[PDB]
Ligand binder design. Structure first.
Ligand SMILES: *[C@@H]1O[C@H](CO)[C@@H](O[C@@H]2O[C@H](CO)[C@@H](O)[C@H](O)[C@H]2NC(C)=O)[C@H](O)[C@H]1NC(C)=O
Ligand SMILES: *[C@@H]1O[C@H](CO)[C@@H](O[C@@H]2O[C@H](CO)[C@@H](O)[C@H](O)[C@H]2NC(C)=O)[C@H](O)[C@H]1NC(C)=O
Ligand SMILES: CC(=O)N[C@@H]1[C@@H](O)[C@H](O)[C@@H](CO)O[C@H]1O
Ligand SMILES: CC(=O)N[C@@H]1[C@@H](O)[C@H](O)[C@@H](CO)O[C@H]1O
Ligand SMILES: CC(=O)N[C@@H]1[C@@H](O)[C@H](O)[C@@H](CO)O[C@H]1O
Ligand SMILES: *[C@@H]1O[C@H](CO)[C@@H](O)[C@H](O)[C@H]1NC(C)=O
Ligand SMILES: *[C@@H]1O[C@H](CO)[C@@H](O)[C@H](O)[C@H]1NC(C)=O
Ligand SMILES: [Zn+2]
Ligand SMILES: [Zn+2]
Length: 528
């Protein structure tokens, strides 16, 4: 008989579940997994072993509770009649029934108006074990560190301040960055959008991550003193990397250890109501100025690499619904909003990104600026209206990384923003990027000099940095190879790759600038 397949299917996966709770079976999962890691030469055997032992516990639990959960698996295999497969299913948040007011671009600031200067720091990736002179091109995923061994005598080891390879930054190079901020300042606030630990992801204890948090935190408080700093949660803060279980998972394997430690390390910067949200799901809002709301989002809940979302991808932590509430409240008060976060919205899971896109379109008048990092390169994302995908209505600045990883100059970013006064638009007016030219900083017996790399309005001839100016820049760059090469140069913080970026490469790079929503090829219909 056939009437027995559904009972048998569930019986199988219920026992599947119970089998995978026993630690010696988890180890057995790891043992074969390490041997396959070695057969496909994914990495040196030592890291294969480390990374699987680190990942196996959380990973087997996630699979047990999702793909192999009887309701899901028998849904996939046997159809809606037996269970219900809903892994990464589509979902929608609710916009309030308040009418969307008429679209209104920001007013040009009056002459002599207050300008707010914001320092933007992202992707610091301090590698505690960075070791000068070690091999920059080792067989591991991160080199120039303890255990990378020595290079051949034909090439030189890692520069004292960094290296142009898959290498991160020694703490002293981070110290130099903060020490040299004087010329670029003074600053009204700092936005600090994540990635404190290095890319040593095969051996990262909770203590290694907290030391990184605690150490780098203390360093910026030492150099910025009274200047408020607003962090956002990066994907490398936790362990395993990208492992951010949503608050519906409680216990030791939750993110309590990370968010609680952040709340105590960041107490001097964030108010009390904000520390509440931070402890729950690593996001928060506060008011830097009267008339301005800042919202710090945790992009790991949108992230394609957060394997916990296999259990439930629907608006994790209710963060998007919470964001709607705050934006409406801001609209009701006539406030403007800054959003900061780590992973840029265009790189999120499809459903999350589409709801965020819709949220941005709805509150285009209230959102004044958007800031992300994570990509380590200097770029941006343009938002358009939902109705026609052709009227530019927002832009996200993707600031480049402090880390070299990979092959880049260290860099950081400063914004001029319509300042602190009643009626301010609070939009970005211009920005500047500073870099450390490693080819001359690494000269023996040299003292690093952080130099201004460029100023946005000056080099791109922009009349402002409103969304329409950046839309225009992308389409200008489509037809002006010299201008695109400038963008390509700055994209890599002054150290572009040797291989020329030709026609296909250019189109893909330009396309990325317009793709603020994931899996939406239509946004690039005018390029290809
Ligand atoms: C919570 O779970 C973590 C694993 O994620 C446990 O951490 C390990 O503790 C041993 C004990 O010496 C260390 O050798 C490992 O390196 C630790 N792993 C990590 C990733 O930090 C931790 O002990 C657990 N805590 C409780 C209270 O159960
Ligand atoms: C994943 O969690 C979300 C909520 O975070 C669940 O969506 C809820 O489902 C219940 C039961 O039908 C409803 O009463 C709630 O109103 C829903 N909330 C939202 C925001 O949609 C979802 O069902 C969960 N998925 C799984 C597989 O457990
Ligand atoms: C959902 C389903 O398959 N139900 C079947 C039913 O159609 C059939 O009449 C009965 C007797 O053979 O066995 C069972
Ligand atoms: C950071 C900063 O300058 N904040 C000021 C605030 O102290 C002052 O009360 C307000 C009204 O002028 O303007 C703004
Ligand atoms: C080692 C190296 O690349 N040196 C270059 C040099 O060739 C060039 O003339 C100069 C000005 O652009 O910049 C630097
Ligand atoms: C969400 O809205 C879209 C319309 O864009 C619709 O296709 C989808 O079925 C909706 N999902 C839910 C759960 O309402
Ligand atoms: C960095 O310095 C080297 C050495 O003088 C120079 O060739 C290169 O053009 C410089 N690049 C930048 C972006 O400063
Ligand atoms: Zn990142
Ligand atoms: Zn990074």
């Amino acid at each position: 008989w056939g009437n027995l397949t559904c009972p048998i299917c569930k019986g199988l996966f219920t026992a599947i579940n119970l089998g995978l709770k026993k630690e010696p079976n988890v180890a057995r999962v790891g043992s074969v997994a390490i041997k396959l890691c070695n057969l496909l030469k994914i990495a040196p055997p030592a890291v294969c072993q480390s990374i699987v032992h680190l990942f196996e516990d959380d990973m087997v639990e996630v699979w047990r509770r999702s793909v192999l959960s009887p309701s899901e698996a028998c849904g996939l295999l046997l159809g809606s009649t037996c269970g219900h497969w809903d892994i990464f299913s589509s979902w929608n948040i609710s916009l309030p029934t308040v009418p969307k007011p008429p679209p209104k671009p920001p007013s040009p600031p009056a002459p002599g108006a207050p300008v707010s200067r914001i320092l933007f720091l992202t992707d610091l990736h301090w590698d505690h074990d960075y070791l000068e002179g070690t091999d920059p091109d080792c067989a591991d995923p991160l080199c120039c560190r303890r255990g990378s061994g020595l290079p051949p005598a034909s090439r030189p080891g890692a520069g004292y301040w960094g290296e142009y390879s898959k290498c991160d930054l020694p703490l002293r190079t981070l110290e130099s960055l903060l020490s040299g901020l004087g010329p670029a300042g003074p600053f009204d606030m700092v936005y600090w959008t994540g990635d404190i630990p290095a890319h040593d992801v095969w051996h990262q204890t909770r203590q290694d991550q907290l030391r990184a948090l605690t150490t780098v935190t203390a360093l910026v408080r030492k150099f910025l003193g009274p200047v408020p700093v607003y962090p956002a949660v990066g994907n490398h803060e936790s362990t395993p990397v990208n492992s951010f279980p949503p608050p519906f998972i409680e216990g030791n394997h939750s993110s309590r250890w990370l968010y609680e430690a952040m709340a105590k390390a960041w107490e001097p910067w964030l108010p009390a109501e904000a520390l509440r949200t931070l402890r729950i799901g690593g996001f928060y809002a506060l008011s830097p100025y009267p008339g301005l709301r800042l919202i710090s989002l945790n992009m790991n809940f949108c992230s394609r690499e957060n394997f916990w979302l296999l259990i439930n991808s629907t608006d994790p932590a209710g963060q998007l619904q919470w964001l709607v509430g705050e934006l409406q409240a801001a609209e009701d008060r006539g406030d403007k909003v800054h959003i900061i976060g780590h992973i840029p919205p265009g790189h999120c899971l499809k459903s999350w990104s589409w709801n965020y896109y819709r949220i941005v379109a709805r509150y285009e008048n209230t959102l004044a600026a958007q800031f992300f990092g994570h990509t380590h390169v200097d770029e941006f994302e343009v938002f358009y209206d939902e109705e026609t995908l052709s009227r530019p209505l927002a832009v996200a600045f993707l600031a480049p990384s402090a880390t070299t990883y990979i092959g880049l100059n260290p860099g950081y970013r400063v914004y001029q923003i319509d300042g602190n006064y009643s009626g301010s638009s609070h939009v970005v007016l211009d920005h500047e990027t500073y870099i450390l030219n490693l080819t001359q900083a690494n000269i023996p017996g040299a003292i690093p000099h952080w130099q201004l790399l460029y100023r946005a309005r000056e080099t791109y001839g922009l009349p402002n940095t409103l969304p329409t100016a950046w839309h225009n820049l992308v389409y200008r760059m489509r037809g002006d190879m010299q201008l695109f090469q400038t963008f390509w140069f700055l994209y890599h913080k002054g150290h572009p790759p040797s291989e020329p970026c030709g026609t296909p490469c250019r189109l893909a790079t330009l396309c990325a600038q317009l793709s603020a929503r994931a899996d939406s090829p239509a946004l690039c219909r005018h390029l290809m």
